[PDB]
Amino acid sequence: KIEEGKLVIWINGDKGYNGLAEVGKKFEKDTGIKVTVEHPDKLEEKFPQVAATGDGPDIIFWAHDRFGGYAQSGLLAEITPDKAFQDKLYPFTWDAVRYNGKLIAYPIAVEALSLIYNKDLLPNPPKTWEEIPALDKELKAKGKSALMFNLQEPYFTWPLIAADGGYAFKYENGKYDIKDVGVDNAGAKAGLTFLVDLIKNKHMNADTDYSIAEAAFNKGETAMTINGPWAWSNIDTSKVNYGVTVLPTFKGQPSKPFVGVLSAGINAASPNKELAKEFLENYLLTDEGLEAVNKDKPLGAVALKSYEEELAKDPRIAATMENAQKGEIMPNIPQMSAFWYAVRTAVINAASGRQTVDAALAAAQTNAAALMDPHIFTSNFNNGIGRHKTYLCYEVERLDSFSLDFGYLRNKNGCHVELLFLRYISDWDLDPGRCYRVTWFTSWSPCYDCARHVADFLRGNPNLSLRIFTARLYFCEDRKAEPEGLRRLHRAGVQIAIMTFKDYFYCWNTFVENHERTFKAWEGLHENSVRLSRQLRRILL
Ligand SMILES: OC[C@H]1O[C@H](O[C@H]2[C@H](O)[C@@H](O)[C@@H](O[C@H]3[C@H](O)[C@@H](O)[C@@H](O[C@H]4[C@H](O)[C@@H](O)[C@@H](O)O[C@@H]4CO)O[C@@H]3CO)O[C@@H]2CO)[C@H](O)[C@@H](O)[C@@H]1O
Ligand SMILES: [Ca+2]
Ligand SMILES: [Zn+2]
């Protein structure tokens, strides 16, 4: 449901979407092809929903942190720029859009948050966060506040949380450990506690959003703020005398903002994949293109070497790059949106008092995971009681071993969990140059049909290993076909086993929102496990 011979673009409203629409005009004049530029709310949320059915825009613009998700779902076309073009752009920006061995998007510009001060109210901006209270007291007397920034988005408070030692996923040896999450470590709590204490002590209000803070600073009501390049335009229009310096340090260490890389990706359902490539390579990622945009609203430090050398003379851009170096670049992995949704809830609740810092950050670590209700796990994985629904917990590892994703799903819409997993892993289109191992923890054995498709799919993909651990056996009677289906899976190389306490214990700690409560085994677990183990042993002979 996407029009051919036309380009629709989605970009966020805080970017220079008018500047971009002009590049679409130049492009239209030189080709005849119309270029619509829309900027819907929550476009980053809307895209995956529409794109999954063959609708959506041809090009989507967002920071790169959300693209691994889009790629896993099979929503992005593979971009393929020649070696000549890849030279035009800084190497490290290409690395930000590298996922699953492919390039998934075109990098446009590097964004990072900076401290923005009013020279008239504060000629010397504070070097530490700890001054801000005394600074706010000194200023409150004159009818002004010291600092105002958006507290409704974790992006803006992340620099303070990350400073003392908070982090998203541990990065070591070039890879990300998705099981080592550092949102609740000592550092995180320290930085966030400072934030809350500012709110308790009446130096910041908890309800301050983006528009409120932007209006405060642009009317000279608050001495400082914290924002990105995109904000500079309206500060100019307001004729405030502003500087753009380094984010203050916390406990001696620098604030570590998450660095975004504005990126264009192409809808895999687009018929206009060529048009999009032509537009992005030869009209936007040029000198003329980026300027048209950067004049509407600043991009930061663009990815285009030629045009960046020119922009880097700006002292504002210098500070941006200084903060970016101090900080880290955002991971692009699918876990990132979950992480962002989680951290968001923490800062809001901790800031409003609904929770304590320690409590909020605890829940964040847990929420960022795909976790089951404990009642649902016990209700369904009991090896003695047969519910009429199937649950599947899965882990997907890479044999280099190293885990890429873990989650759970249940049968839905008359669609068995086995076929649902097949779609999820097909859509992903894993790099066939490497080897992976899929592990299922399922509550029922697979029906006969699904045993075909899983066997077919596995002979279709020699580089995948499947291990199924099951709680019960479905229709393993002699007047049923299912028992052979388990042999056919076994012959396709699949390791089938019955779950045991070790397995239930692992699942309890991995796929369940257990609240630290220890796994209590049910009466008949060890007996049922033993009985079934033999019953299976009898099937695979
Ligand atoms: O929870 C309710 C909210 O849900 C939606 O917000 C989500 C996004 O969908 C997530 O992707 C994520 O947002 C990240 C964002 O992905 C990340 O790039 C960064 O965004 C910066 C961006 O780099 C910069 O260019 C500029 O646009 O500012 C952005 C920050 O505002 O950080 C984001 C998170 O702070 O998480 C959010 C929820 O936090 C939906 O959009 C919301 O309307 C909804 O309320
Ligand atoms: Ca760094
Ligand atoms: Zn089935």
Integer CA distances (angstroms), 185 to 99, 133, 352, 430, 498, in order = 28, 25, 21, 33, 37
Beta-carbon contacts of 2 under 8 Å, excluding residues fewer than 6 positions away, are 8, 54, 55, 56, 57, 58, 267, 269, 270, 271, 272
Question: 416 a known binding residue?
Answer: yes
- As a whole number of angstroms, the distance between CA 8 and CA 513 comes to 41
- 192: number of Cβ within 10 Å: 28
Task: Supply 447's token pair.
Answer: 């029906």
- 252: number of Cβ within 10 Å: 8
- As a whole number of angstroms, the distance between CA 9 and CA 98 comes to 22
Nearest CA to ligand 1 atom 34: 155
63 Cα to the center of ligand 1, angstroms: 9
Burial of 469 (0-12, 13-18, 19+ CB in 10 A): buried
Q: Smallest Cα–Cα separation from 31: which of 274, 260, 265? A: 274
Active-site positions?
A: 418
Beta bridge partners of 245: 115
Nearest CA to ligand 1 atom 25: 63
The answer to whether the CB of 45 is under 6 A from ligand 1 is yes
What approach was used to elucidate this structure?
A: X-ray
328 Cα to the center of ligand 2, angstroms: 5
- Would you say domain 368-540 falls under CATH 3.40.50.1980? no
Resolution of the PDB structure in angstroms: 2.8
Burial of 281 (0-12, 13-18, 19+ CB in 10 A): middle
Q: Smallest Cα–Cα separation from 227: which of 325, 343, 116, 124? A: 116
The answer to whether the CB of 209 is under 6 A from ligand 1 is no
Atom of ligand 1 nearest to the CA of 14: 27
Ligand nearest to the CA of 447: 3
Atom of ligand 1 nearest to the CA of 44: 9
The answer to whether the CB of 150 is under 6 A from ligand 1 is no
- 3-state secondary structure (DSSP) of residue 481: coil
Cβ(186)–Cβ(164) under 8 Å?
yes
CA angle 487, 493, 498 (to 5 degrees): 60
The single-letter code of the amino acid at 421 is F
Q: Listing from the earlier edge strand, what are the strands of the sheet with 242-245?
A: 145-147, 222-227, 114-118, 242-245
H/E stretch holding 180: strand 175-182
HEC per residue, 25-92: HHHHHCCCCCEEEECCCCHHHHHHHHHCCCCCCCEEEECHHHHHHHHHCCCECCCCCCHHHHHHECHH
- 3-state secondary structure (DSSP) of residue 465: strand
267 Cα to the center of ligand 2, angstroms: 32
Cβ(416)–Cβ(445) under 8 Å?
no
Best of 150, 263, 344, 347 for a ligand 1 pocket test (most atoms within 8 Å of beta carbon): 344
- 100: number of Cβ within 10 Å: 16
Q: Smallest Cα–Cα separation from 13: which of 37, 47, 36? A: 37
Beta-carbon contacts of 452 under 8 Å, excluding residues fewer than 6 positions away, are 485, 488
Calculated CA dihedral for residues 347, 348, 353, 358, nearest 10 degrees:
-30
Which residue reads 């992976």 in tokens?
Answer: 436
Nearest CA to ligand 1 atom 22: 63
Beta bridge partners of 469: 441, 497
346 Cα to the center of ligand 1, angstroms: 14
Question: 447 a known binding residue?
Answer: yes
Q: How far does the chain reach from its first CA to its final CA, in angstroms?
A: 52
Task: Supply 380's token pair.
Answer: 């369904």
For the structural domain made of 114-258+339-352, what CATH number should be given? 3.40.190.10
Nearest CA to ligand 1 atom 18: 63
- As a whole number of angstroms, the distance between CA 510 and CA 381 comes to 14
